[PDB]
Structure formats: structure tokens, C-alpha cells
Write a protein that binds this ligand. Structure first.
Ligand code: HEC
Ligand code: HEC
Lengths: 87, 86
């Protein structure tokens, strides 16, 4: 495994897992982190997940200034990898 | 009571997305059950108004989005449901 992925996993647990436990979505069940939902919303890329983390959307807050760009890349890679291999 | 029905309406419009049925899917250790409010020192009008105003963790604040009067109505609704059982 990658050290970046393991680092992204830890950042995910601290910042994302309460709302996206197991790649789901507590608030909005139509916007999970499953690959099919990511693809249906054009979010199945590192750049699009980083943009989502940075700006947020709807009931998801933005993390600009609270998570470094480098850490955002790590968590984006963690999410996409889990999505591709199945949460 | 015009206050409790109004608080119910403000709750449906602002809190039900995360606290439907008095639960808390994001953080299941912090529901709106009276027992959880007691466990966190939140079983009071003053404490719930502060929570609404400032938020905490994954809960946003509502300052400027809900009037002070409506916040008191929401707090009374929550405590009434908590006491009766959601
Ligand atoms: C609750 C306060 C959340 C936090 C913390 C995190 N996410 Fe989120 N996310 C949340 C909601 C309510 C939504 C839907 C927003 C909308 O406007 O509909 C999302 C969405 C996403 C997505 C898009 C999913 C899709 O299109 O299927 C992604 C990729 C995503 N969220 C990622 C993500 C990350 C990496 C987080 C930790 C930094 C994170 N979210 C936190 C709710 C909340
Ligand atoms: C998700 C975007 C939320 C919305 C909208 C509302 N609440 Fe919330 N609430 C949420 C979380 C994640 C938490 C736990 C916060 C933490 O730091 O751990 C809470 C907590 C409360 C509490 C305390 C409950 C307890 O057992 O201690 C109360 C009294 C509360 N929330 C009330 C409340 C009201 C009245 C809302 C509508 C104005 C509201 N919340 C919206 C998540 C979210």
C-alpha cells in the first residue's frame, strides 16, 4: 500500500467519516462516495474531489484553510481508491 | 401554544435534515433524547439556544439565519419532544 493512502485514510477519519461513514452520506443519501454516485455527478477524479473538499456544497462545509492542499490530495486519493475497490 | 407549533415548524425547516426523529445520524452519541441532552449539559433553553447560535463540530451555527425569538421557540419544542419522547 501507499503511505499517501494511509495518510489520506487518517485524514478522512478525522474530517469526513462522521458524515460519510463507510463511503455513504448521512445527510443526503443520493450523494455517496460510491463510484457510481461519483461518476453520476462528475466527481470521479482527484481534482473534482479536491474542489469539493475546498469549497463544499449544500450541507457539506468547505475545508479551505482547515486542511492543507497536500492533505486534500491524500484524502482525494484515499476516497477514489476506496470507491474503485469498494467501500 | 403559538410558540411550540412555531418551533416545530422552524425545526422542520432547519434541523430535521440532521435530527429527524430526535436522532443524530452524523454523531449518534449526541441525539436530542432527554438522556443525551442531560449527558452533555444541554437540557436547558439557554444551552440549546447557544448550540443553535454557535454550532459545534459538524453542526453549523444559525446566527443571523434564525431569529433569537425563533431560537427560543425551537428550544422549547426540542425540550418538549425530549420530555414526551420523540
Ligand atoms: C457533513 C457536515 C459533511 C462533512 C464533514 C463532509 N461531507 Fe462530503 N458531503 C456532505 C453532503 C451533505 C454532500 C452532498 C452535498 C450536496 O450539495 O448535495 C456531500 C458530498 C460530497 C461529495 C460528492 C459526492 C457525490 O457526488 O456523490 C464528495 C466527493 C465528498 N462529499 C467528500 C467529502 C470529504 C473528502 C470530506 C472530508 C474532508 C467530506 N466530504 C466531509 C456532507 C459532509
Ligand atoms: C447537520 C448539518 C446539523 C444540523 C442542520 C443541525 N444539527 Fe444539531 N447537531 C449536529 C451534530 C453533528 C451535533 C453533535 C456536535 C458535536 O460537536 O459533537 C449536534 C448537536 C446538537 C445538540 C446537542 C445534542 C446533545 O446530545 O448534546 C442540539 C441540542 C442540537 N444539535 C440542536 C439542533 C437544532 C435545534 C437544529 C436546527 C436549528 C440543529 N441542531 C441542526 C448536526 C446538525
Amino acid at each position: 500500500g501507499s503511505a499517501d493512502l494511509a495518510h489520506g485514510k487518517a485524514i478522512f477519519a478525522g474530517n469526513c467519516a462522521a458524515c460519510h461513514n463507510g463511503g455513504l452520506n448521512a445527510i443526503n443519501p443520493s450523494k455517496t462516495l460510491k463510484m457510481a454516485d461519483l461518476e453520476a455527478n462528475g466527481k470521479n477524479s482527484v481534482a473534482a474531489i479536491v474542489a469539493q473538499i475546498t469549497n463544499g456544497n449544500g450541507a457539506m462545509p468547505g475545508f479551505k484553510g482547515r486542511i492543507s492542499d497536500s492533505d486534500m490530495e491524500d484524502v482525494a486519493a484515499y476516497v477514489l481508491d476506496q470507491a474503485e475497490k469498494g467501500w
